[PDB]
Design a binder for this molecule. Structure first.
Ligand SMILES: Cc1ncc(COP(=O)(O)O)c(CN[C@@H](C(=O)O)[C@H](O)C(=O)O)c1O
Ligand SMILES: Cc1ncc(COP(=O)(O)O)c(CN[C@@H](C(=O)O)[C@H](O)C(=O)O)c1O
Ligand SMILES: [Mg+2]
Ligand SMILES: [Mg+2]
Ligand SMILES: [Mg+2]
Ligand SMILES: [Mg+2]
Ligand SMILES: [Mg+2]
Lengths: 379, 389
């Protein structure tokens, strides 16, 4: 059997017991709120990870690219939301997916994008399902939640244009700037209220709006109530990461994704251990640098997964990571503690960024064996 | 003409590719290749390009055709790929892990002249014991710390150099040389500081080789390099080869260091405008950090380019517009100066294609399964590159 001692390094390891606990926690919270969970698979892009989310009770998926829609559809998943403002040039790709049987949903936030979809759908005989993206927190895309004229103009373009106006959605991504339950709870309420208000405005205009979809992992876990909401979209929670830990929604011990690395040398005067997990393994994401505890390029754990507080990757080049004390001191006799060849596991800043560096995950079972779970790269 | 007509009908250009896409401007890439090879020829040293920037067979083929001698790789997966493609002279320039010794042995047994590096007595002892067990005289170079960038034996640490060189030589391995990488050059931004660092890198690696040879140990190769010190060195006496890699494409970190212009940057990411926030002066593009990478190396340099410098479809810089933010599949295009551009939707209409110059070519390239190699006629060809280990 393949195990953490036999793998080459670096490797992206999923602790299956931790991932299942994360999947159960999120599904149980959504069940308590009376809403569907539509996981965002862009975090893993791996068929077996999404299958475990579905087995726990998830309803459909959210994807960040049409490549992910192709992969998951080829795997038998048909209820797919492509939650990135639709580019008109990708309409042939989307059409071919729907004609093949994939119930692929698109989103827009502009009259011009809604007109491009509706005109192509009429030409091709396709009533595209399209949701309107709502900006509830100023994070990124979307129709402002009280910009009613814009909301109604896009709504009538789709519905009068013969398309299926399927719903409204929002992602309150500014939740990643927060770090207290009170602030997260308030942002989750602003997200819920803004999305519900857009749905209510459509409906008062006699336009259909059957789905109201909100979510980010921190607002999904913090929201006190979700009246008016039909589903929540959350993705990074499947593994968690150190950014989530700093936001306050999980502990380091809950993070299910780590990078297995080998010690390949040392700088004794500086108290460095050099590992073979550089930024090509961890990614360049440094999201914890802007937070109350900086973890460098990741938190060190031993081969058993025990967190080693106070050792982090303080630097990284492409294929070399620099392990050193978080307090800045030069650990004495670093080589005596971490001899050449010692294996360690590094928890990521951002699970979605680190996962994308690997062709595959190594799914670690209770007995210590691993199975390789491929994931998708590119577009 | 059946093949001809069908190929024409299938041929992509920058208007027909899906976005995002990593586009190599071949004419800029050839100018970078010629420039570095001519500089190394002028210095009388070999150029051993570091292929970890592209990990692409046709890009390394163009470096070889121009005059390069061998390659440097950052992983044994690169050594496996490039050897399969016919490159036999390969330096694996990352401190050797003992557990990878079976793979290095297999590659040498298949005919790859694969060189390994160490910087410790324990790594030397592991290589020599495995080589004696397996009947293999591994070739091993000793890595030298000349500028404090990362790791390596100190150039002035004679006792440790000798201990490692003797462990290898007495152990029946081939002690083949010393190498250094003065990566602290990426913190510099004047020709004077770069020329002085290049001289410190040359002097320190030659110093180490001279200490080994003074002890009777072989050390025929002296290998130095980073792209900025390769381009800045006045003299390379005592050096046998230079390793450089990011030069093949350049990037905005190199532009800021001062060793190229933005117009020399051969790699760009083709993106489409997919939305706006008109009141904030934002255009939203489909190149987020999954396309650009999270690399922000320009953040602390003289000119911060955010997640990349915006260029028009013809690849010309659009001054003052950069990607100021990025989420996974969304980039935020806005003024670098922090003004909200008026009429952003007029400046950048929905569906507009743009090209984004990267902070760090090695980091952006690794986000793509393949490059789109752009010829002067506007045609592109898919050039696969390696992902993972
Ligand atoms: C449109 C949309 N919906 C849901 C999610 C899931 O959010 P998480 O559960 O918090 O992962 C996202 C996530 N988007 C990413 C991104 O990079 O775009 C986050 O904003 C982030 O990691 O910063 C989403 O876009
Ligand atoms: C051992 C070794 N040799 C040569 C090079 C090539 O340097 P460039 O020509 O400047 O790319 C490198 C490069 N190493 C990278 C890295 O990430 O490790 C650079 O230090 C960097 O991009 O920061 C090298 O490691
Ligand atoms: Mg975000
Ligand atoms: Mg994320
Ligand atoms: Mg460096
Ligand atoms: Mg580089
Ligand atoms: Mg392998």
């Amino acid at each position: 059997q393949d195990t953490l001692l036999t793998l080459d390094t670096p490797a992206a390891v999923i602790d299956l017991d931790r991932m299942q606990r994360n999947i159960a926690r999120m599904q149980q919270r959504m069940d308590a709120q009376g809403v569907r969970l539509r996981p965002h698979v862009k975090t893993s892009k791996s068929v077996p990870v999404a299958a475990a989310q579905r087995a726990a009770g998830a309803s459909g998926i959210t994807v960040s690219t049409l490549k992910e829609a192709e992969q998951f559809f080829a795997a038998g998943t048909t209820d797919i939301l492509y939650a990135v403002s639709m580019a008109p040039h990708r309409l042939p790709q989307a059409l071919q997916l729907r004609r093949r049987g994939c119930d692929l949903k698109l989103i827009v936030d502009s009259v011009a994008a809604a007109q491009a979809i509706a005109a192509f759908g009429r030409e091709q005989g396709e009533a595209f399902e399209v949701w309107i993206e709502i900006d509830t927190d100023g994070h990124r895309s979307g129709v402002g939640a009280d910009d009613t004229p814009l909301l109604l103009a896009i709504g009538r373009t789709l519905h009068d244009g013969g398309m299926r106006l399927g719903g409204v959605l929002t992602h309150a991504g500014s939740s990643y700037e927060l770090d207290t339950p009170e602030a997260l709870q308030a942002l989750a309420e602003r997200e819920r209220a803004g999305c519900v208000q857009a749905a209510e405005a459509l409906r008062a205009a006699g336009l259909p709006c059957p789905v109201v979809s909100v979510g980010s992992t921190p607002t999904a876990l913090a929201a006190s109530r979700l009246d008016g909401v039909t589903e929540v979209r959350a993705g990074v929670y499947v593994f968690f990461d150190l950014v989530m830990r700093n936001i306050g929604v999980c502990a380091a011990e809950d993070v299910a994704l780590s990078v297995l690395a080998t010690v390949i040398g040392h700088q004794a005067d500086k108290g460095w251990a050099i590992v073979d997990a550089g930024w090509m393994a961890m990614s360049r994401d440094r999201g914890t640098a802007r937070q109350k505890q900086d973890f460098g390029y990741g938190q060190v754990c031993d081969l058993q997964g025990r967190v080693m507080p106070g050792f982090v990757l303080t630097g990284a080049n492409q294929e070399h990571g620099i392990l050193a004390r978080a307090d800045g001191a030069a650990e004495a006799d670093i080589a005596t503690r971490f001899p050449l060849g010692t294996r360690l596991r590094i928890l990521p800043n951002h699970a979605c960024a680190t996962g994308a560096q690997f062709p595959a995950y190594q799914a670690l079972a209770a007995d210590g064996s691993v199975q390789t779970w491929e994931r998708l790269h590119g577009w």
